[PDB]
Amino acid sequence: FAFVKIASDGKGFTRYGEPYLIRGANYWQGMNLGADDCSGGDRKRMELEIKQMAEMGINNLRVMASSEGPDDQPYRMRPSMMPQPGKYNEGVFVGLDYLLDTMDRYNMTAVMTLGNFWQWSGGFGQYVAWITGNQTIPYPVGDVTYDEFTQFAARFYNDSEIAPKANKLFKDHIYTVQNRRNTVNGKIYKEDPVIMSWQIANAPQEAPASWFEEISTFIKKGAPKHLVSAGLESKLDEYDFDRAHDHKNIDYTTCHCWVENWGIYDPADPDGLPHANEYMHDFLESRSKWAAQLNKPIVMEEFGMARDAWRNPEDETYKYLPSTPTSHKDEYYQKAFNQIVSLASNRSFSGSNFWAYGGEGRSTYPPNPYGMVWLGDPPHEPHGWYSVYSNDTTVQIIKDYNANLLKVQKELSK
16 A cells, blocks of 8 residues: 555556656755754754645655765765764664655655765765775865766776675665664655655666666565666666666666756856757657656656856856846746646656755855755755755746646546
8 A cells, every 4th residue: 555656558657546646856865854953953944844845746755865974074965874884873864764754744755765876975986985995085076077086986886896895785775774664653664655666876877787687676675565766867878778777677767857067058148048948858858758668657856957147147156045046947947847747648757856955954054063054955066056945936836837747647547
């Protein structure tokens, strides 16, 4: 009962024997906000943000169920859930238990991201540092490029000496999360129907098919009642999409669309929005076809856009202020959402998770005593870059999309 499944025609999800469309948000800060105050959380704020997301019609949060220390590293969540391999900060782990229990109380499902290619939860670069014994990770700041960081972190699955060791540690972490007993409601994670899926990691970068095969099968054997996702961006071509998704134990497909990060969209250009709308339009259509070729659902489980930096393009801070409007972002979200509603009524898309809900956090607030300004932008990025705040104009467009998708879900159930 209540476990999310794949429809028997392979074209969407079901839940309670009916179609289940994803009215989703990203809430990767949920575990750290759920923690007690002692461990830097603000659980009353977390409860309020999940209430706000429920009033906006959200039924699904993609959340981060890993974070690696050590806790003196820059650009990452602090305090980490797993400060050393196999050694856990119980106060952070309790935060993930409270996050899942509060989602349970709002009848939301969770996509549980078990790791991260990127540096903001420690991630694959940090397992590489643990194995090589060198804690100097080449973070992509100053003179160090993203290519250099990427080649370093990709040793996690590409280097024949590092990868078996790093992946032993990573599987120990997956095993520990899937076997966690929720201290709030007593459920073991692998039997909790609030979890929609286990997700291998956020955004592996050209990882080999044999690694997707190995880890997806490890996770499925660990929690056979749950769906398994790859966490891929699908930012390359159809082969890269198949290398991640064409596996017996990968139940559905994802895509992440990031127009600014990929050089497509300039938020400081008053005339720059149409490039992003056109790119998002062709991205949804093409990725929908790639998913149809494998006969598996697809969710756009991350996408987002900056505030209106173009109104004051010479002022760098202005781009990140909560008072700055989000006209471009609102129109971009609206058109993406309208297209998804359309593809979904044709059983060609299953929903999306905008990146990311910032809630009551604001980019102008001081860091908490662990140096965290919690909101929807992780600490390797400028605070407030993509966050959707509780009273942004974008909230009504998200609310209208989630009503529209729930209407499509009803029509698909008749």
